[PDB]
Structure 1
Amino acid sequence: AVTNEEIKTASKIVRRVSNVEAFDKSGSVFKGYQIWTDISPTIENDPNIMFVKCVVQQGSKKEKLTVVQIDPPGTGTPYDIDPTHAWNCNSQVDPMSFGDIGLLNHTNIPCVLDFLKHRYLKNQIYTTAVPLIVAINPYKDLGNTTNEWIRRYRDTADHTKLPPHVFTCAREALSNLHGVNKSQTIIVSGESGAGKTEATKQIMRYFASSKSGNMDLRIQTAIMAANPVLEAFGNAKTIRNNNSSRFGRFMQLVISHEGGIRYGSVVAFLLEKSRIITQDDNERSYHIFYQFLKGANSTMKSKFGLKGVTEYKLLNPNSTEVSGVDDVKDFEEVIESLKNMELSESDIEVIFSIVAGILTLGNVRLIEKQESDAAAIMDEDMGVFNKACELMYLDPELIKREILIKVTVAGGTKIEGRWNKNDAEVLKSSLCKAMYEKLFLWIIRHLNSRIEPEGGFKTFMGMLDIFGFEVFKNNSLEQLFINITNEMLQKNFVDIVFERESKLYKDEGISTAELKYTSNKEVINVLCEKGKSVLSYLEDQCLAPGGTDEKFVSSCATNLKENNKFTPAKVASNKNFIIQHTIGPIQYCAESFLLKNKDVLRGDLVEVIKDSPNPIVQQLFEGQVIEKGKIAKGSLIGSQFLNQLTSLMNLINSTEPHFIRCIKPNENKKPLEWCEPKILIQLHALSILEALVLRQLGYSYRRTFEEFLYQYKFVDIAAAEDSSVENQNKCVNILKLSGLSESMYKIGKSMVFLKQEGAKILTKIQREKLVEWENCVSVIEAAILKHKYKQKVNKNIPSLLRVQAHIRKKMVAQ
């Protein structure tokens, strides 16, 4: 599973920042001092492991440490590492005893990986890095998103007693919305298989759980019923996920403050149309095709003339079956769900008629006919063609003509010619893909017509379910659009972190002049700004006749010198180029950019479809512009998508965001399996490690005057218990005599502001003033910990009795 490319980029993310303090003042190693290191034969031999835990041996010099590995178990062999390969360790801290990574004493990379691992190995998959929520795919049902857990998370007095959970984010989001009349968006992102769609379904069910009833249950039921339906039509089995979402999903919801969905709206973008025609090996097309072909009853097979799943050109004959997936049972769920979105039986019958026609059109074969070199339908497939058009309520002769008869303009004269076999198959394929995509969008249009509020949304809960940054070696158009979307969301992330912090300093009267902001405005521009951007030039090239992938690249390299965000690629500088995204350089290959961007049904085929007698097929392409001459931006994927994205981002930017960052821990779909290089790569692409850094900057440590006094009283117990001093001036006194430099604290209107480093120093200062208690506290704690450990053993003694009981039964066997 772990490739060498994964190891290359994972070692790039590794950095060593803070120094390791393994020696006491006298120069001797602290007895037993533990560190993390990336040098070990364990690491060379097992690519799931990136760091191991060692203890520095007495006698180490300071410029080369001699260590012995202790976790995972080793040889006891001493070896030598450079200090730049030792990282500090959080020894003796319970990873389950708090929810946020930033509360750790050290947050270097091995410490962060290990903190998340030992929570994950105890089935705690949720951890925050404010404002981010990290959620790791357990790849088994942990049993923590049931109705009883929904009720516990919704009805508990103080949600702070409970561990991080997607319900906690749902509950805060809903609580803020009704609390200050502000819309919210929950943004769920991550790579394939990470658990995004499971997360958003769990949040939806939370939102659908009213404390005591929902009069608008009919609307809520339609919204929930949309999950099986959208998955059937838009999800497919890939190598990485048996249930991959091949479209981005946005939802707006109206939710009563005690739970219950009252209104909603659904938006799908960038459906993977190409999957309708062909699929890689061990992959399927959209679930609906297999649900339908396997689940339809004998009468529905008769009407539509259905054959078997292994009998269709558009369906991969060899990946028909997916372990764990009962397509027939899923069909019955889809049929019932369609009715719950208030489609009649007539409507549903039309829907599957169209699907049956799409499948059938794919089985029509074309041949070359030379007198010229025109194309034609194979004679034995003329019924198959006719049935497919009847199945789609299309005019068979008019559809035949648009596929076989080419009109070109030469001079300024229209000339009737013929498409050859290759181009005519491209037209048959376009029709198949167009009809499926528009049928998918029609179903959503219909849904929305039942569940949207008549006036539009006053205040709403948004939900976004999308890929995060995608980085392969070969990146294409599909990844470009994805990575642009995530640049937009990164800017939203950096903005909200800056606004919230700037607001807090202002409110307390702290100078903001030292606040930090890493803008990505320059790379959004290089991708989007009209007239000087990749997307502008992709558009321009597509419009102009004789555009090539290569001429697209070339215009970019000559016009985007102004920012370093565009970088021509070294190898194959035609057709390859690099962009300096926020997460690092990403390389794109412009092969087929123009092919994929212009992949939109346009022209006279659309006009035939619009002329169908059937009222649903009429609405598939309702009001689509007639493209009589040339080709217009209105039918380019990138041009339409960018308007969608802009519209979508204006909406989100008007809301308070919540970021659920999903992580897939291994590539084997297995529980309790931890692959560090792949997890580390995702910690980087999800800006989790940056989130820690971001929050630690400046005066990151705040406590109200009486929290500071409760916390730090013994720094100067005199100053803290002076009955003639207001609580604010007691803090000034304590800090003035602590030893801290002025640069390290500021006194706000109500809080003490501390740089992170000053807080640790203040903590160390208080501990030296308390040296006399060190022995007494060690023994109390240790004695109690022993008892705490014996209780955990007593729980499993009834289990242990059985092991021993059968052991003695087997000794009797002798």
Structure 2
Amino acid sequence: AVTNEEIKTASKIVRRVSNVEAFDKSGSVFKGYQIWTDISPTIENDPNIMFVKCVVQQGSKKEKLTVVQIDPPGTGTPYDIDPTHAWNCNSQVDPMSFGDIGLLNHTNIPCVLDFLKHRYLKNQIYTTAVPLIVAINPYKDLGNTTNEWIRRYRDTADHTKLPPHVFTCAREALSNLHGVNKSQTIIVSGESGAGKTEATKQIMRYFASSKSGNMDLRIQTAIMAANPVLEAFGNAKTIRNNNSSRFGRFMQLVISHEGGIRYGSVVAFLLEKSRIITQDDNERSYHIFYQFLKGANSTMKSKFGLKGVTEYKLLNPNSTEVSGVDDVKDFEEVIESLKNMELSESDIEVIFSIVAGILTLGNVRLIEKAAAIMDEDMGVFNKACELMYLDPELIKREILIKVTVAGGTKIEGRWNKNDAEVLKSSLCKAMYEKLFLWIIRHLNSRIEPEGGFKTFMGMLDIFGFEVFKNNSLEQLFINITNEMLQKNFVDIVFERESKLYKDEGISTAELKYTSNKEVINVLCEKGKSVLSYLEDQCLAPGGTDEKFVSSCATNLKENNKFTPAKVASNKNFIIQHTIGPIQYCAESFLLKNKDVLRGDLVEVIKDSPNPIVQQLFEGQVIEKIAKGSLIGSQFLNQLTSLMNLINSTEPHFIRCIKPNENKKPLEWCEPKILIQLHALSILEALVLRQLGYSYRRTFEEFLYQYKFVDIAAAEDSSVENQNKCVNILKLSGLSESMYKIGKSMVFLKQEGAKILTKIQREKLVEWENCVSVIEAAILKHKYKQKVNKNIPSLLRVQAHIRKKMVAQ
């Protein structure tokens, strides 16, 4: 499962920032001094392990350390590591005692990974790196998202006494909305299988839980019913996920302060059309196909003339079954959900007639006569069109008759087998995508507010940055979205910090901002971008994929953000994305961008006697291709609208992690988790929060915490709290650069706060023995209490051992 490309990437993410203090004043190793190292036979032999715990041996030199691995258990063998391969350890720390990664003394990569690991192993899958919430997929039901948990997270007096959870984010977002009359957006991001759709569904169920009723239950049920429907039509079983979302989703919700969804709006964008036609081995198409064919009753099967799951060219005959997926039971849920979306039994029959029609059309065989439909399949063709409420003669004419414009005259001709197969495929894909969008459009007409949203709760459930072996146009669109989301993240972190300093009268010139404006421009900017050049090449008469790549290298020399490829320089390009360089393959890019149904076929569909079929392409406009018709052109339009809307809201960020590629609980692959920590800006979030005046506590908070730095200045009745703090700070030994006194708070640099903790500790040296003995005596009591809870279980083991003894 672990690639060498993952090992190369993971090792590039590791950095040694914190220098290890293994020696005393005398130059002697601190007895038992623990470090993290990336040098071990355990690491060579186990691709899952990236770091091991070692103790620095008595006799080490500062230039080269002699260490012995202790965790995982080793040989007891001393070996030598260079200090650039030793990292600080958070020894004697409970990972369950606090929720933020940043409250750790050491936040180096082996330290972050260990904290997350030990929490994950105790079924604490949520951890913050403010403002981000990290959610690691447990690949099992932990039972932490039940109604008892919703009521607990919702009705608890002091919100800060609850551990991190997706419900904490749902609660904070809903409090701010109603508290300061401001719209919010919960952004759920991660890779396929990370747990995004689950986190989304969990948050919606939290929102749908009202303390004392919802009179708008009819709207809430329609919205909640969208989950099974959107999944059936837009999710598929891939190799990396049995229920993969193959679209981007955005929702706006109107939720009462007590819980209860009153209004909503759903948006589904970038649906993977190619899946409708072909699927890789061990991969299915959209669940709906299998749910429908397997679950449809005898009457429905005879009406639509349905054949089996293994009997359709559009469906892989070998990946029909999925482990723990009952398509029949899921179909019953889908029918009920469609009914709850206020669709009539007539509407539902049209929905499945079109699905049956798309499937039937895929079975029609074409031959070379110029192309022609096989006579054997002429009835199969007619049934397909009747099922899709389309004109059989007019649909036939659009698949087999070609209208070329030579000179300035229209010339009737014929499509060859290959060209006609493309048109038939395009019709299948277009009919499906527009039906999927119509179901959403219909839902929105039942759930949306008549005059638009005043204040809403936004929700984005989107694929994070994608870095595959072959990165195509879909990866380019995903990575462009994620660049806009990264700008949103760095912008809000800055805006929030800049306001705090300003409110307290601290200098905002010291603050740091890393813009991705350069890479946004190279990808989107009108006239000088990859997307602008993709459009020009698509609109050009002799436009090719190679001329697109060539025009990119020729006109994007001002920034390093565009870099031409080394191996096959043409047909390949590389972009300097925020998470590093991503290499795209421009092969089929123009074909992919132009993959939108042509003018004349659309007009036949609009001319259907069925009102639902007439609505699929409502006001599409007739047409070679125009700018606004290309996938990328429409994509950038939607993206700007979507981003303008989110930039108007207070953002919330849920970053999901897939801990292994095996879909197993309690299985931790460090190289894979590290690539994700990086890609999800979890590591950058720690960096950002640590910069500048990192520590901020009220005068009273500072005085309780740093009391014994100078107990005389702290316990002086005459001086004010603002003055006491300047007296403690001036006497301490801290440089003026390390601290600032604000209106209500003491502002400290991260380094200054650590020195001040160390000053206070020197002043209380006489307590060290007393505090050690009290703490250790309590820990011994605490450890025995954890044994006591498990003694009833042990009595059972012992009882069975003594029974097995008698048996002998």
Using the TM superposition, give the Cα deviation of residue 631 of structure 1 relative to its aligned residue in structure 2, in angstroms.
1.1
Alpha-carbon distance between aligned partners in 1 of 2:331 and 2:746, rounded to the nearest angstrom: 61
Alpha-carbon distance between aligned partners in 2 of 1:522 and 1:3, rounded to the nearest angstrom: 31
Alpha-carbon distance between aligned partners in 2 of 1:377 and 1:640, rounded to the nearest angstrom: 34
Using the TM superposition, give the Cα deviation of residue 603 of structure 1 relative to its aligned residue in structure 2, in angstroms.
1.7
For the residue of structure 2 that corresponds to 1:97, the secondary structure is coil
Q: Is the 8 A contact 2:473 2:592 kept in 1?
A: yes
For the residue of structure 1 that corresponds to 2:732, the secondary structure is coil
For the residue of structure 1 that corresponds to 2:587, the secondary structure is coil
Deviations 1:20-78, CA, capped at 9 Å, x for gaps: 00000010000000000000000000000000000000000000000000000000000
633-642 or 396-405: bigger deviation = 633-642
- Unmatched 5+ stretches in structure 1: none
Q: Is the 8 A contact 2:537 2:547 kept in 1?
A: yes
Q: Is the 8 A contact 1:182 1:656 kept in 2?
A: yes
For the residue of structure 2 that corresponds to 1:631, the secondary structure is coil
Alpha-carbon distance between aligned partners in 2 of 1:680 and 1:545, rounded to the nearest angstrom: 46
Using the TM superposition, give the Cα deviation of residue 247 of structure 1 relative to its aligned residue in structure 2, in angstroms.
0.2
Q: Is the 8 A contact 1:102 1:129 kept in 2?
A: yes
Deviations 1:771-801, CA, capped at 9 Å, x for gaps: 0000000000000000000000000000000
Which residues of 2 match residues 13-412 of structure 1 at below 5 A? 13-369=13-369, 374-412=370-408
Residue 490 of structure 2: aligned partner:
494
Could you list the structure 1 runs, at least 4 aligned residues long, displaced by more than 4 angstroms after superposition. Answer: none
Deviations 1:598-640, CA, capped at 9 Å, x for gaps: 111022100000000000000000101111xx21122210000
Residue 633 of structure 1: aligned partner:
627
Residue 432 of structure 1: aligned partner:
428
Q: Is the 8 A contact 1:235 1:287 kept in 2?
A: yes
Using the TM superposition, give the Cα deviation of residue 82 of structure 1 relative to its aligned residue in structure 2, in angstroms.
0.1
Alpha-carbon distance between aligned partners in 2 of 1:414 and 1:539, rounded to the nearest angstrom: 26
Q: Is the 8 A contact 1:190 1:686 kept in 2?
A: yes
Using the TM superposition, give the Cα deviation of residue 728 of structure 1 relative to its aligned residue in structure 2, in angstroms.
0.5
Deviations 1:312-356, CA, capped at 9 Å, x for gaps: 000000000001000000000000000000000000000000000
Alpha-carbon distance between aligned partners in 2 of 1:226 and 1:475, rounded to the nearest angstrom: 31
For the residue of structure 1 that corresponds to 2:633, the secondary structure is helix
Q: Is the 8 A contact 1:471 1:586 kept in 2?
A: yes
Alpha-carbon distance between aligned partners in 2 of 1:464 and 1:412, rounded to the nearest angstrom: 48
Alignment of 1:443 with 2:439, yes or no, is yes
Deviations 1:250-295, CA, capped at 9 Å, x for gaps: 0000000000000000000010000000000000000000000000
Deviations 1:112-163, CA, capped at 9 Å, x for gaps: 0000000000000000000000000000000000000000000000111110
Using the TM superposition, give the Cα deviation of residue 473 of structure 1 relative to its aligned residue in structure 2, in angstroms.
2.6
Residue 455 of structure 2: aligned partner:
459
Residue 771 of structure 1: aligned partner:
765
Q: Is the 8 A contact 2:87 2:110 kept in 1?
A: yes
Alpha-carbon distance between aligned partners in 2 of 1:96 and 1:723, rounded to the nearest angstrom: 39
Using the TM superposition, give the Cα deviation of residue 564 of structure 1 relative to its aligned residue in structure 2, in angstroms.
1.2
Q: Normalized against structure 1, the TM-score is what? A: 0.99
Using the TM superposition, give the Cα deviation of residue 18 of structure 1 relative to its aligned residue in structure 2, in angstroms.
1.0
- Unmatched 5+ stretches in structure 2: none
Alpha-carbon distance between aligned partners in 1 of 2:598 and 2:163, rounded to the nearest angstrom: 53
Using the TM superposition, give the Cα deviation of residue 488 of structure 1 relative to its aligned residue in structure 2, in angstroms.
0.1
Alignment RMSD (CA, Å)? 0.4
Deviations 1:484-524, CA, capped at 9 Å, x for gaps: 00000000000000000000000000011110000010110
Alpha-carbon distance between aligned partners in 2 of 1:773 and 1:319, rounded to the nearest angstrom: 68
Residue 623 of structure 1: aligned partner:
619
Q: Is the 8 A contact 1:361 1:385 kept in 2?
A: yes
Alpha-carbon distance between aligned partners in 1 of 2:737 and 2:439, rounded to the nearest angstrom: 61
Q: Is the 8 A contact 2:126 2:166 kept in 1?
A: yes
Residue 7 of structure 2: aligned partner:
7
Alpha-carbon distance between aligned partners in 2 of 1:159 and 1:264, rounded to the nearest angstrom: 27
For the residue of structure 1 that corresponds to 2:706, the secondary structure is helix
Alpha-carbon distance between aligned partners in 1 of 2:602 and 2:469, rounded to the nearest angstrom: 37
Alpha-carbon distance between aligned partners in 2 of 1:50 and 1:41, rounded to the nearest angstrom: 11
Alpha-carbon distance between aligned partners in 2 of 1:289 and 1:576, rounded to the nearest angstrom: 36
Alpha-carbon distance between aligned partners in 2 of 1:360 and 1:474, rounded to the nearest angstrom: 32
Using the TM superposition, give the Cα deviation of residue 95 of structure 1 relative to its aligned residue in structure 2, in angstroms.
0.3
For the residue of structure 2 that corresponds to 1:710, the secondary structure is helix
Deviations 1:170-195, CA, capped at 9 Å, x for gaps: 00000000000000000000000000
Deviations 1:527-570, CA, capped at 9 Å, x for gaps: 00000100000001001112111100010110111111100111
Alpha-carbon distance between aligned partners in 1 of 2:162 and 2:621, rounded to the nearest angstrom: 54
Deviations 1:351-386, CA, capped at 9 Å, x for gaps: 0000000000000000001xxxx1000010000000
Q: Is the 8 A contact 2:193 2:244 kept in 1?
A: yes
Q: Is the 8 A contact 1:295 1:331 kept in 2?
A: yes
Q: Is the 8 A contact 2:185 2:651 kept in 1?
A: yes
Alpha-carbon distance between aligned partners in 2 of 1:603 and 1:622, rounded to the nearest angstrom: 13
Total equivalences in the alignment: 808
Alpha-carbon distance between aligned partners in 1 of 2:421 and 2:599, rounded to the nearest angstrom: 16
Alpha-carbon distance between aligned partners in 1 of 2:756 and 2:321, rounded to the nearest angstrom: 63
For the residue of structure 1 that corresponds to 2:583, the secondary structure is strand
Alpha-carbon distance between aligned partners in 2 of 1:350 and 1:499, rounded to the nearest angstrom: 50
Q: Is the 8 A contact 2:295 2:331 kept in 1?
A: yes
Alpha-carbon distance between aligned partners in 2 of 1:389 and 1:473, rounded to the nearest angstrom: 40
Alpha-carbon distance between aligned partners in 2 of 1:586 and 1:690, rounded to the nearest angstrom: 19
For the residue of structure 1 that corresponds to 2:267, the secondary structure is strand
Q: Is the 8 A contact 1:579 1:586 kept in 2?
A: yes
Alpha-carbon distance between aligned partners in 1 of 2:376 and 2:509, rounded to the nearest angstrom: 78
Q: Is the 8 A contact 2:366 2:421 kept in 1?
A: yes
For the residue of structure 1 that corresponds to 2:710, the secondary structure is helix
Using the TM superposition, give the Cα deviation of residue 472 of structure 1 relative to its aligned residue in structure 2, in angstroms.
1.6
Deviations 1:410-463, CA, capped at 9 Å, x for gaps: 011110100000000000000000000000000000000000000000000000
Q: Is the 8 A contact 1:602 1:635 kept in 2?
A: no
280-289 or 596-605: bigger deviation = 596-605
Which residues of 2 match residues 636-675 of structure 1 at below 5 A? 636-675=630-669
Alpha-carbon distance between aligned partners in 2 of 1:558 and 1:412, rounded to the nearest angstrom: 34
Using the TM superposition, give the Cα deviation of residue 401 of structure 1 relative to its aligned residue in structure 2, in angstroms.
0.3
Alpha-carbon distance between aligned partners in 2 of 1:722 and 1:342, rounded to the nearest angstrom: 71
Q: Is the 8 A contact 2:599 2:621 kept in 1?
A: no
Residue 779 of structure 2: aligned partner:
785
Q: Is the 8 A contact 2:183 2:457 kept in 1?
A: yes
Alpha-carbon distance between aligned partners in 2 of 1:750 and 1:155, rounded to the nearest angstrom: 31
For the residue of structure 2 that corresponds to 1:511, the secondary structure is coil
Using the TM superposition, give the Cα deviation of residue 474 of structure 1 relative to its aligned residue in structure 2, in angstroms.
1.6
Alpha-carbon distance between aligned partners in 2 of 1:447 and 1:474, rounded to the nearest angstrom: 36
For the residue of structure 1 that corresponds to 2:96, the secondary structure is helix
631-640 or 327-336: bigger deviation = 631-640
Q: Is the 8 A contact 1:470 1:479 kept in 2?
A: yes
Q: Is the 8 A contact 2:606 2:617 kept in 1?
A: yes
Deviations 1:684-742, CA, capped at 9 Å, x for gaps: 00000000000100001001000000000000000100111000100000000000011
Deviations 1:645-690, CA, capped at 9 Å, x for gaps: 0000000000000000000000000000000000000000000000
Alpha-carbon distance between aligned partners in 2 of 1:253 and 1:486, rounded to the nearest angstrom: 23
For the residue of structure 1 that corresponds to 2:662, the secondary structure is coil
Alpha-carbon distance between aligned partners in 1 of 2:621 and 2:64, rounded to the nearest angstrom: 72
Using the TM superposition, give the Cα deviation of residue 571 of structure 1 relative to its aligned residue in structure 2, in angstroms.
1.3
Q: Is the 8 A contact 1:34 1:56 kept in 2?
A: yes
Using the TM superposition, give the Cα deviation of residue 579 of structure 1 relative to its aligned residue in structure 2, in angstroms.
0.5
